[PDB]
Design an enzyme around this catalytic site. Structure first.
Site, PDB file in Angstrom:
ATOM      1  CB  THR A 159      -1.054  -0.045   1.132  1.00 33.62           C
ATOM      2  OG1 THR A 159      -1.956  -1.129   0.853  1.00 33.62           O
ATOM      3  CG2 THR A 159      -1.886   1.214   1.102  1.00 33.62           C
ATOM      4  CG  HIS A 420      -1.503  -6.689  -1.170  1.00 37.78           C
ATOM      5  ND1 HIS A 420      -0.609  -5.695  -0.838  1.00 37.78           N
ATOM      6  CD2 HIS A 420      -2.505  -6.617  -0.265  1.00 37.78           C
ATOM      7  CE1 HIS A 420      -1.061  -5.034   0.218  1.00 37.78           C
ATOM      8  NE2 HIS A 420      -2.228  -5.556   0.565  1.00 37.78           N
TER       9      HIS A 420
HETATM   10  C1  Y8E Z   1       3.894  12.724   7.643  1.00 38.83           C
HETATM   11  O1  Y8E Z   1       3.460  11.674   6.793  1.00 38.83           O
HETATM   12  C2  Y8E Z   1       4.271  11.560   5.653  1.00 38.83           C
HETATM   13  C3  Y8E Z   1       3.430  11.978   4.489  1.00 38.83           C
HETATM   14  N1  Y8E Z   1       2.829  10.832   3.829  1.00 38.83           N
HETATM   15  C4  Y8E Z   1       1.584  10.932   3.256  1.00 38.83           C
HETATM   16  O2  Y8E Z   1       0.935  11.965   3.319  1.00 38.83           O
HETATM   17  C5  Y8E Z   1       1.032   9.726   2.621  1.00 38.83           C
HETATM   18  C6  Y8E Z   1       1.391   8.483   3.108  1.00 38.83           C
HETATM   19  C7  Y8E Z   1       0.856   7.333   2.535  1.00 38.83           C
HETATM   20  C8  Y8E Z   1      -0.045   7.441   1.478  1.00 38.83           C
HETATM   21  C9  Y8E Z   1      -0.404   8.703   0.997  1.00 38.83           C
HETATM   22  C10 Y8E Z   1      -1.336   8.807  -0.087  1.00 38.83           C
HETATM   23  C11 Y8E Z   1      -0.890   9.228  -1.322  1.00 38.83           C
HETATM   24  C12 Y8E Z   1      -1.791   9.330  -2.367  1.00 38.83           C
HETATM   25 CL1  Y8E Z   1      -1.197   9.855  -3.879  1.00 38.83          CL
HETATM   26  C13 Y8E Z   1      -3.128   9.037  -2.240  1.00 38.83           C
HETATM   27  C14 Y8E Z   1      -4.066   9.167  -3.399  1.00 38.83           C
HETATM   28  C15 Y8E Z   1      -3.580   8.612  -1.003  1.00 38.83           C
HETATM   29  C16 Y8E Z   1      -2.685   8.494   0.065  1.00 38.83           C
HETATM   30  O3  Y8E Z   1      -3.019   8.075   1.320  1.00 38.83           O
HETATM   31  C17 Y8E Z   1      -4.371   7.742   1.521  1.00 38.83           C
HETATM   32  C18 Y8E Z   1      -4.650   7.316   2.945  1.00 38.83           C
HETATM   33  N2  Y8E Z   1      -5.457   7.946   3.798  1.00 38.83           N
HETATM   34  N3  Y8E Z   1      -5.439   7.210   4.940  1.00 38.83           N
HETATM   35  C19 Y8E Z   1      -4.638   6.073   4.867  1.00 38.83           C
HETATM   36  O4  Y8E Z   1      -4.433   5.242   5.707  1.00 38.83           O
HETATM   37  N4  Y8E Z   1      -4.118   6.126   3.569  1.00 38.83           N
HETATM   38  C20 Y8E Z   1      -3.201   5.126   3.018  1.00 38.83           C
HETATM   39  C21 Y8E Z   1       0.120   9.861   1.574  1.00 38.83           C
HETATM   40 ZN    ZN Z   2      -3.581  -5.129   2.068  1.00 41.84          ZN
END
Ligand code: Y8E
Ligand code: ZN
Ligand SMILES: *[C@@H]1O[C@H](CO)[C@@H](O[C@@H]2O[C@H](CO)[C@@H](O[C@@H]3O[C@H](CO[C@H]4O[C@H](CO)[C@@H](O)[C@H](O[C@H]5O[C@H](CO)[C@@H](O)[C@H](O)[C@@H]5O[C@H]5O[C@H](CO)[C@@H](O)[C@H](O)[C@@H]5O)[C@@H]4O)[C@@H](O)[C@H](O[C@H]4O[C@H](CO)[C@@H](O)[C@H](O)[C@@H]4O[C@H]4O[C@H](CO)[C@@H](O)[C@H](O)[C@@H]4O)[C@@H]3O)[C@H](O)[C@H]2NC(C)=O)[C@H](O)[C@H]1NC(C)=O
Ligand code: CA
Ligand code: CL
Ligand code: NA
Ligand code: NA
Length: 805
Positions: A159, A420
């Protein structure tokens, strides 16, 4: 410490994050345990649910409700998404015929169509067809917009590595999120999905889309939603933000669903329990599109429906245990599951040995469901090595399996039926892409492509300049109606020399011999023309590759092949030849078995020598243009020139000889001729990028002949296979590979057998994009075709996968 005494009144899901210990009302406050006392009450209202009913129409506003059905809700931007449907006799977006969106139809004061990324976790590509009956909103997006049959994730197919690749355009090795668990030896810190350390900025490399937008004056909504915020509330929050004043309104937004991944782990990818989560995701998409329609933004917003990875059937009984291979099992730390990463338990232990760990894990059981690799020997297409967070020892795990350290790890931790993380070429790991909106094409299918390409396009969609990334910008221009990026070919940095005959045979003391002193004015003119490039249009179909770095090299012409010969590396950077459907394979005559011939166009000082190979007991040699495919006995002498020779371990020559003797002719027959470009690759620091000469770790003993880490071939033919490769009017078709140049065939468990049982399988594992070879060689291919450059860019990113349909 958070002073949670202040209030969230008028601040719910505020875009900018306030300086602690002031209490926060932004989405991430839940994650940091830092929300104001009244966040739930004010910002997470649920009263009366998410939908209008007939009895609520035109009600008196009640600020307690989750969403509103009062007359003022449109202007407040906080109606329930079905408001106009229930109360104003409107149709749902999904029930409207689709109509081409030729231009953005946006409310006054919108400077650009907003972008909404609707991301779904675990959404396997085949769900689009197999779940189509229960996903009518998603199906309408798909069939009316632009879609791919699937989108390739990055490895590992987890993920966070994939969403952050979507955000940055970067391989995990470059952005730094190389798995769901990680140890960074420099920080001496660990990263976990559960917990706090993951929020530290030091883990997150490159520049994600939201920071790219902000630096360039485009405002962004939140991308990371706190897990406790329900989906309906994420949607309403996006819609509210979309009603802000022009100066405050974001242009880019994201929604995320942890479904269907969450259920897929429990029930497997196609468990009967999976229908409902697919229905629910479709409902949410319906809510978004109904909400956009109410705001009159449904023919203004670009919507991307995109997955991070798929889901495979995996149960507890399909687990391999390192305890069944290693006696020292307690001296290792394994990162387990759908991939394996191994490091020493204690850095104070000098009796730990990676070499014997690999050997104890290599081909030890007849149906072994994982294969150990030093990370630098992993298929180059995975781009998974150039990061200190990636352990030296890697286990590629077969689809449907897990690896674990000891059995106790599995039952003191069957729960799961899906997982996965496997190799990103695996069909079950593929995910989805749909683009819908004024900037995307109407009812258009595009070929599958890699998620590393999307960052560039999202930047195009937003009029932003992308930070440096691993996409090839312009390779997805065919998705777009407008806003295309108009790339130019890189400039050639080094121009070639064209040497004529400059050396007498006796000037060479290379210790080479050839039985060639066997002796015509008709065919003397003939051979001269061949050395001047008279057959070049046959063997060099797409122009010569451009050399994009500073170097000294010679173009050499021959009847059967053309080469770009490097005076620095003492071998060709590239060798190009065409094999027609009708070509004949011959053998190497007996008197020519050990023949190597000086090349009178190239000085002794810039040539390899045979003595070096004689003295090097490990190292032998092979040829780039195969002697087997010579067009005549007389042309065959060209194939033994010292300038066509390259260093090869005997174990590798088994592979190479089978490719050249059997496979090239097989491809030419199947594809109606092929053009082949082959060459060496030097990637001693495994960064995916051409080594400079001072980076070479290994030479043929006693000489300055550098030893390649890999050999590549690019095999091109006509996509319309009724036309022969050398007379093709339209689009091209390519497959390529980057074979590791290894002194053993330990990677191939069946290698004691005939090459016909194992070599093609090896080459398929090491399939590559022409783009991967460009990075590794500093060459730029397909410089002279009749095709548009954007089309050639798409060809160069193509990967031939060898998965079924
Ligand atoms: C301080 O942190 C470091 C910053 N890192 C993030 O900001 C981050 C981390 C990981 C996944 C993403 C991310 C990226 C994209 Cl392009 C999209 C579309 C969705 C995303 O996250 C969705 C999400 N919301 N809640 C949850 O659990 N997830 C996986 C963003
Ligand atoms: Zn999973
Ligand atoms: C995919 O796309 C990406 C992006 O385009 C490509 O990666 C780029 O490749 C470049 C070459 O490898 C590299 O350029 C180097 O940058 C050095 C400074 O870098 C910092 O700043 C940038 C920009 O803001 C930033 O992005 C970097 O972030 C990295 O590091 C932190 C950790 O410290 C991570 O958070 C982050 O994830 C990222 O890590 C990744 O990259 C690094 C390499 O930088 C790897 O080590 C990691 O494993 C990980 O993959 C940085 O914060 C700069 O110092 C370099 O300059 C040296 O070399 C040049 C050669 O021209 C020379 O002129 C200089 O003298 C200098 O040499 C000196 O240092 C040497 C090494 O210490 C020393 O030996 C010498 O003797 C000298 O003293 C260099 O220009 C660029 O940073 C990355 N960018 C990113 C984002 O990864 C990638 O190649 C593409 N992949 C493929 C296959 O195409
Ligand atoms: Ca390199
Ligand atoms: Cl992981
Ligand atoms: Na030898
Ligand atoms: Na073997």
């Amino acid at each position: 410490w958070t002073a949670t005494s202040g209030s969230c009144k008028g601040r719910c899901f505020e875009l900018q994050e306030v300086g602690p210990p002031d209490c926060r009302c932004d989405n991430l406050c839940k994650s940091y345990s830092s929300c104001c006392h009244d966040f739930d009450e004010l910002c997470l209202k649920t009263a009366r649910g998410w939908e209008c009913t007939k009895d609520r129409c035109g009600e008196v506003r009640n600020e307690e409700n989750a969403c509103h059905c009062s007359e003022d809700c449109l202007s407040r931007g906080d109606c329930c998404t079905n408001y106009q449907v229930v109360c104003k006799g409107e149709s749902h977006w999904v029930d409207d015929d689709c109509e081409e969106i030729k231009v953005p139809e946006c409310p006054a004061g919108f400077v650009r169509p907003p972008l909404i990324i609707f991301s779904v976790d675990g959404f396997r590509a085949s769900y689009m067809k197999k779940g189509s009956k229960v996903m009518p909103n998603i199906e309408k997006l798909r069939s009316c917009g632009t879609h791919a049959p699937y989108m390739r994730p990055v490895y590992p197919t987890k993920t966070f590595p994939n969403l952050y690749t979507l955000a940055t355009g970067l391989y995990p090795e470059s952005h730094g999120i190389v798995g769901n668990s990680m140890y960074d030896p420099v920080f001496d810190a660990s990263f976990h999905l559960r917990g706090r350390e993951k929020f530290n900025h030091r883990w997150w490399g490159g520049q994600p889309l939201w920071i790219t937008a902000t630096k360039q004056g485009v405002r962004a909504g939140t991308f990371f939603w706190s897990v406790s915020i329900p989906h309906e509330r994420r949607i309403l929050t996006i819609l509210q933000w979309l009603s802000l004043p022009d100066n405050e309104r974001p242009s880019v937004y994201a929604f995320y669903s942890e479904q269907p991944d969450f259920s897929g782990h429990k029930y497997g990818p196609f468990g009967p329990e999976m229908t409902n989560p697919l229905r629910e995701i479709d409902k949410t998409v319906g809510q978004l599109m109904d909400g956009l329609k109410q705001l009159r933004l449904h023919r203004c917003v670009n919507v991307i429906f995109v997955g991070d990875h798929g889901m495979e059937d995996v149960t507890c009984d399909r687990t391999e245990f390192l305890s069944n291979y290693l006696t020292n099992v307690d001296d290792i730390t394994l990162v387990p599951g759908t991939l394996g990463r191994i490091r020493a338990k204690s850095i104070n232990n000098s009796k730990y040995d990676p070499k014997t760990i690999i050997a104890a894990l290599t081909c030890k059981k007849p149906d072994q469901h994982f294969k150990p690799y030093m990370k630098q020997h992993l298929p180059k297409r995975l781009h998974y090595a150039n990061n200190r967070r990636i352990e030296d020892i890697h286990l590629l795990v077969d689809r449907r399996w897990h690896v674990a350290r000891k059995p106790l790890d599995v039952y003191k931790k069957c729960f799961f039926q899906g997982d996965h993380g496997f190799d990103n070429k695996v069909n079950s790991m593929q995910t989805v892409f749909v683009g819908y909106g004024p900037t995307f094409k109407y009812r258009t299918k595009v070929p599958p492509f890699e998620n590393i390409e999307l960052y560039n396009v999202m930047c195009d969609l937003l009029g932003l300049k992308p930070a440096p990334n691993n996409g090839t910008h312009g390779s997805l221009n065919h998705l777009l109606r407008t806003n295309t990026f108009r790339p130019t070919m890189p400039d050639e940095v080094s121009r070639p020399n064209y040497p004529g005959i400059m050396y007498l045979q006796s000037e060479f003391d290379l210790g080479c011999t050839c039985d060639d002193k066997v002796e015509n004015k008709l065919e003397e003119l003939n051979k001269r023309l061949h050395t001047k490039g008279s057959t070049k249009e046959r063997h060099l179909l797409y122009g010569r590759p451009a050399v994009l770095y500073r170097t000294s090299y010679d173009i050499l012409y021959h009847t059967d092949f053309e080469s770009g010969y490097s005076e620095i590396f003492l071998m060709p950077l590239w060798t190009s030849y065409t094999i027609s459907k009708q070509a004949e394979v011959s053998s190497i005559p007996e008197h020519l078995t050990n023949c190597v011939r000086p090349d009178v166009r190239v000085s002794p000082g810039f040539s390899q020598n045979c003595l070096a190979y004689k003295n090097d007991k490990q190292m032998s040699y092979g040829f780039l243009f195969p002697p087997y495919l010579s067009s005549s006995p007389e042309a065959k002498y060209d194939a033994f020139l010292v300038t066509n020779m390259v260093p090869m371990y005997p174990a590798f020559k088994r592979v190479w000889a089978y490719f050249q003797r059997v496979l090239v002719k097989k491809y030419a027959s199947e594809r109606n001729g092929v053009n082949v470009i082959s060459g060496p690759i030097f990637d001693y620091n495994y960064d995916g990028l051409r080594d400079t000469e001072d980076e070479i770790k290994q030479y043929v003993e006693g000489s300055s002949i550098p030893v390649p880490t890999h050999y590549y071939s690019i095999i091109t033919s006509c996509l319309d296979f009724t036309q022969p490769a050398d007379k093709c009017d339209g689009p091209l078709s390519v497959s390529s590979f980057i074979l590791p140049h290894r002194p053993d065939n330990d990677e191939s468990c069946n290698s004691s057998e005939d090459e016909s049982k194992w070599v093609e399988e090896l080459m398929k594992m090491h399939t590559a994009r022409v783009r991967d070879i460009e990075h590794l060689t500093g060459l730029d291919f397909y410089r002279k075709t009749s095709r548009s450059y954007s089309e050639i860019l798409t060809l160069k990113t193509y990967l031939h996968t060898y998965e079924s349909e």
